[PDB]
Each structure stands twice: as structure tokens, then as C-alpha cells.
Write a protein that binds this DNA or RNA. Sequence first.
DNA 1: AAAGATATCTT
DNA 2: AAAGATATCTT
Lengths: 244, 244
Amino acid sequence: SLRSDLINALYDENQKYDVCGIISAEGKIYPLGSDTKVLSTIFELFSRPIINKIAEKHGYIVEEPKQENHYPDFTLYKPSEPNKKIAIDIKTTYTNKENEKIKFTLGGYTSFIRNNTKNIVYPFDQYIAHWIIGYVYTRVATRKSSLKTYNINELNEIPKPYKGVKVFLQDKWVIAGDLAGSGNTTNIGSIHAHYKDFVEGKGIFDSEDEFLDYWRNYERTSQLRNDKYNNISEYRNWIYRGRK
Amino acid sequence: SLRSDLINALYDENQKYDVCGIISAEGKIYPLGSDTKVLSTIFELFSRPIINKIAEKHGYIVEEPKQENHYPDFTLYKPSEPNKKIAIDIKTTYTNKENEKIKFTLGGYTSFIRNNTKNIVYPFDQYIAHWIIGYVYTRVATRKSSLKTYNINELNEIPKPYKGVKVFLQDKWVIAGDLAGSGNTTNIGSIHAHYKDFVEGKGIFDSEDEFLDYWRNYERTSQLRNDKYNNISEYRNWIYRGRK
DNA sequence: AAAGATATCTT
DNA sequence: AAAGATATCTT
């Protein structure tokens, strides 16, 4: 399927190549920065062609946001099935070592999940799937990346700002957690686990219906939440009380 | 001066090279997406080696943030002048059509300007200058050919998601405005004006102390600013009256 | 954790 | 505009 084809392609492209700089049209190469800010942009652009290659193979048109601050990164759809849209978002995070726990910010909990058309390329109810492509990189210990430019013949002298990268494709609801991923920008948090749990889809939600109800009713501050719910057990206790 | 040299080199480099994609170590080239999050990453990375070369020629050490969430992008300083550090921040915004009014978000107003060591590489009282390297780009819409990989020989054929990049170097207090640049993330807003006003420094503050005083007392929301002040006139009246 | 930082944009 | 969206990080 599109999903298994896309998953294999992602593993493969990641296995073959290591992005290492930005290139001018004149052939001048600039080394990469050290942040997730720089790497989330890089993994994003690295995934574009792969996604597009695979969607076209399965008959899906690919649309990116036309306006900024609209989810998702990639909207896949056959024109014969306008309500079978698939949402693909690239998310990046880091590890200090290759064996620690990671966590992702999985998108707002107050935009398109509480309002059909808010900050979303197409109305939320037109999407039947919401996949996350997750990139995990291990930071390099050095905090002093190249400060000079390179030529095309020097590509292997360019220090890369990561020592290892891993990628997974998973449904957003499966890896969602019950703790916010951000405070002022109200983001759903994923589980806090090892990379394999993400791949294996060992979430805390029992259904996507439960994932959505939880984030749709989750209060923004600690105060409001202490009178309702802070985690999955308390939400399950809140359902028992009559949603009160 | 460092500043005259730095701006000439920025202006010269801008006019001579054009970023057109990210490259892997293997030589495979990935085109650029159109959102400003991409273009701000690229302009950041394009400026790094220029800044570094010019600082070096003036005997300035260049230090980049050791932790994310820390201003500024580039801290310049001499070992002989530890308290005369120079902060350089790269800011990027767009224009729908070449030469319309633009605005920038100029950093939090509730972090290092209200707390000497908050989210800043070095205590804020060791910096004597805060420079903004501002980039303006005219947005060019993404197309088909941007969703495939290119090779080094096709470097001149890759569609770019921007046009007419202009660059300026200016003091943050000089282009600073009196309306917030963002709500929930409490950022200072720049003046809302044409490119030439940034170059020439046609801001609204009479001094850097006023800028600082205005932004260290600006309230976070409209309701809280109703009482106090929402713009420079009102701040000058509030000042006139005795800060009440 | 929770709350608010990091940069910039839309409505 | 003001306010709260875009993504992720610290602390």
C-alpha cells in the first residue's frame, strides 16, 4: 500500500543519503546549523520528493499548504475520492545518546481538532488519516559547526550536525500522549518513549475516538485541568462522572 | 568599521549567490520549500560564513548559541573587551509583491530585556550593540519540478521559491516599533514600513533607553495596556505624567 | 510537568 | 491590532 511503500522509501532514502549543506546556483556550499530549527527544515525538504514519488505511484495528488501556518505539510488525495484525504506531517526531535526516550509535539489541540476549518488546508472532516513522519537525530557533541563555505568537490569534508538519524511513519493518534507538548502554543504531546515504541505504536490511547475526545476537552492550564483531568486515568474517570 | 564591512559583504554576497537547495554528501540535491521557516533557515545559514569572515578581520571571536532557545544568533567579541559584546540576530520576512510594507518580530520583550540572564548566551549587560540582519524576500509559488531531486549539473535549473531578496543591517532599537510583533509569544514588533526605512533607520524611538523603557513596561495584553499604554504617544504621555 | 521561551505568521 | 496560530524546545 501507499503507507508501506512510503515507509520503505523513507527508510531507504534515509539509509542512502546524509544532507550536509545548502547549495547556491553558482555551486557554493554552506554548512548546516546546529539546531532542531535547522534540522526540522532539512528533514522536511528531504522528505518532499520521496512523498511525491510514492503518492504519484499510487494515484494521489500532493498538495502543500498554500498559506503559512496551515496543517498539514502534505495533503494526499485522489480526485475521485475527495473525502479520503491523507494528512502527512514531518516532525523532528533529537536524542543525546542512541538509547534514550524521545517526545514530539504533535500539533495544536485548539485549531483544526476543535474547529473543522481552522489552520488546516482542507476541512478536517475531509481527512481519513493523519500520519506523522518522525525524524530522530543524535546531536553531535561538538557545538562549533563549520564556519566557512565549500565547493562541490569537498562534500565529504563537511561536518554534519547529527551522528545518526532514524525515521518512522505512524498514525498521529497511536503515538499521542496525555501530557501537553507545549504550553503557550497548546500542542498535543506524543508519548514519552524509545524510538521502537513509536515504530511499534505502543500508545496510551485505546482508539482515535478517545485520542480526539481527550485533546478536544483538555484544558489549557494546570488549574482548569485539576478540576477535570490531567492524564488518561483522570479523563477516564471524567467520562465516568458524566463528562463533568 | 566592523559594521560597514559586515553590511558590504552581506550586500555583496546577496547580489552574487542564490541558494537553490540542500545537498547530501553523496551529491543529491533537494529543492527548497516556500514557507518563511525554510527561507529564514537558509538566510541564517547563508550569513554565517560571511559574518565569521568579517568579525575575524576585525579580530572578533564569533560564538553561536550553545543551547537552543537562546538569543542571539551571533555574539561577537574581543577577548580585550568582554563587556563590549555584539549581538547579531538574523530576521527574515516576506513581501507578496516587490517593495510593499514589511514588519519583523524583534525578539521577546519578557526575557533578556527584563532579566539580565534569561534566554541569552551572555548576560545582557555585556552587550553594547544588538544588530538585526534583516532579509526581505518576494514570495514565488512552488511548482511541479520542485518535488524531485536534482544533480549538481542541473544546479541552474532548480526552481527557487523566492525572488528579489534584499538585506539590511541595523540597530534593533532603531527599527523597533511600538506594537507587539506577536501575542502569545510576546515579541517586540518592528516598525511597519518599506525596506528603505529600515536601512535609513526611520524608527519611532528617540533613543535606545526609550526603546528599552517602552518594551520593559509594555503590558502583555490589550486589557492590561488600556490602563497604561499601547503606543508611543500614550507612552510619552504616561512618562510626562510621572509613569502613571 | 507546566509554563513560557526560541522565530514569524494569519485572521 | 490583538490574539493566537505555525514547530520544538527548556527548565
